[PDB]
Amino acid sequence: LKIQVHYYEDGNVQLVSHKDVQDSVTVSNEAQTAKEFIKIIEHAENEYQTAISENYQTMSDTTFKALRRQLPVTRTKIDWNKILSYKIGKEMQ
Amino acid sequence: DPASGTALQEISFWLNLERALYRIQEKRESPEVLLTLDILKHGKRFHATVSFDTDTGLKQALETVN
């Protein structure tokens, strides 16, 4: 189930994903495996779309925090006047 | 002012500064002054010791003089 989504309003963003679904069932009958094939399909697709949405939900604090935090670990802004004015004590350990 | 006075006065003034800063280095290198510095170092007071060479602009003055 490969997905490609592009968005470029005042920028550029591309979502590329796929889930290597793997499932099995014995071919019992035709109508049974037809709607059962749909059962596996509805399962994996509802699962996959929902999971993708929640991956978007947990992205401000996990993925981005792997790249760039929203706020530093001190949870405050930067006193540029402090860093430039004097060394924070980094020389001392 | 670099143009204050005649040419020989300004040129001789830079010469005077050269030998005078060397005399300041002479007064700096005496063992009595070093003894006072040793007192402040042995007494764990690093302020006057480090400032004796950094706060005094004698080092940079002597290097430009040289």
Binding site: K65, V73, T74, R75, T76, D79, N81, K82, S85, Y86, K87, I88, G89, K90, E91, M92, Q93 | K44, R45, F46, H47, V50, S51, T54, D55
Partner: protein, 370 residues
């Protein structure tokens, strides 16, 4: 330029001072002011009215000891001026307040007026070349040498926890309650009255402090020990009497872990630590739990650290290494940290010059408060 920075560690109960670079504070004495109560009759008596330091401690019976600072906030500035002036006297420093920059410890979350009027006092009556007000937790961590960790202090009038990350003391996680040593002594006085022994004189409250300093401990189980009758050890007064304490020795410092006994909606020390840690970045909780430093004289009770460990384990999440350090200089932690901080070359750029104070004013201090 000046001679050397003087690290004056304040404290609502014990002021501590000395020059920077010193190993231990050479000058420490209680932060009280005693003036006589009786009548001068015989000539040749103790001349002078206000006494501070060892002389005020010696002739303790005559004085009417009061404190000018309470809960890290100065209530009387005249007595504080005399105390600071006493620090610069011939009995303590023998120097002048014109050739020494001053490092000044100060408790967090205090009013702006403390820094403002204290700065006026120094730069105007003392005319110090440079003043620098700082925190106390930052100094205690500098004294231990490590750099990231919380600091749990409980001096005489305040108690707080500061999660420090490499020197940047996180200002959004400093919990602070006002239940410290002096208040524990006060509650101990109440319990001594309930025992039958009365101590109410101002120069007798100090005896109550002495009892707190050498006859109290912390029970591990707070209730199991209350349901038993202890050995009821005695106590010798300076007078020579005898006081059997009993249950009024473990419930007295119990106040720090439950300020319900004093009737207050504040929290215990353990809750101050856990809230100070939990109101921080989730990525630093394990590092903060692995580095807790105690300081302040109220952390000297018997069984203090052990009970703190038990309490924190009850509040911390499961299987997180909790580690409480407790150096041997909890009384001198902030002062030793001041000696390390002010003895650096960056301190020249870290203070506030007198010229700057005359130019901008108090706003310059709040600007360069860190």
């Amino acid at each position: 330029i000046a001679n050397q920075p003087v690290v004056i560690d304040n404290g609502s109960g014990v002021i501590k001072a000395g020059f920077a670079g010193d190993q231990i504070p050479k000058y420490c004495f209680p932060n009280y002011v005693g003036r006589p109560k009786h009548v001068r009759v015989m000539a040749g008596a103790l001349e002078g009215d206000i006494f501070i330091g060892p002389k005020a401690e010696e002739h303790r019976g005559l004085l009417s000891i009061r404190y000018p600072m309470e809960h890290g906030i100065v209530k009387d500035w005249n007595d504080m001026e005399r105390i600071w002036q006493y620090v610069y006297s011939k009995d303590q420093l023998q120097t002048f307040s014109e050739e020494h920059p001053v490092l000044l410890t100060e408790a967090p979350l205090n009013p702006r007026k403390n820094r403002e009027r204290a700065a006026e006092v120094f730069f105007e009556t003392f005319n110090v070349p440079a003043l620098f007000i700082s925190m106390q937790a930052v100094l205690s961590l500098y004294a231990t040498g490590r750099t990231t960790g919380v600091v749990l202090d409980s001096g005489d009038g305040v108690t707080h926890a500061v999660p420090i990350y490499e020197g940047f003391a996180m200002p959004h996680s400093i919990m602070r309650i006002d239940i410290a040593g002096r208040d524990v002594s006060r509650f101990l006085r109440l319990y001594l009255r309930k025992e039958g022994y009365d101590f109410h004189s101002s120069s007798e409250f100090e005896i109550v402090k002495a009892i707190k300093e050498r006859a109290c401990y912390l029970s591990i189980n707070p209730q199991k020990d209350e349901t038993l009758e202890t050995e009821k050890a005695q106590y010798y007064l300076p007078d020579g009497s005898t006081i059997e304490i009993g249950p009024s020795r473990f419930r007295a410092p119990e106040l720090l872990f439950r300020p319900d006994l004093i009737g207050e909606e504040s929290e215990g020390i353990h809750e101050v630590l856990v809230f100070a840690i939990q109101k921080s970045d989730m990525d630093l909780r394990r590092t903060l739990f692995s580095n807790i430093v105690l300081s302040g004289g109220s952390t000297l009770f018997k069984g203090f650290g052990d009970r703190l460990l038990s309490e924190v384990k009850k509040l911390a999440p499961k299987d997180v290494k909790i580690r409480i350090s407790a150096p041997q200089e909890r009384l001198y932690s902030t002062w030793i940290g001041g000696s390390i901080l002010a003895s650096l070359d960056t301190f020249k750029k870290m203070w506030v010059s007198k010229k700057e104070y005359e130019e901008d004013g108090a706003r310059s201090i709040h600007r360069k408060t860190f």
